[PDB]
């Protein structure tokens, strides 16, 4: 993302 992460099932 931008210093992190979200893009994943749950
Ligand atoms: Re993400």
């Amino acid at each position: 993302c931008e210093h992190x992460r979200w893009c994943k099932p749950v």
Side-chain angles (χ1 to χ4, degrees):
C1 308
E2 44 178 90
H3 304 91
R5 44 154 281 104
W6 179 85
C7 318
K8 189 179 183 180
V10 59

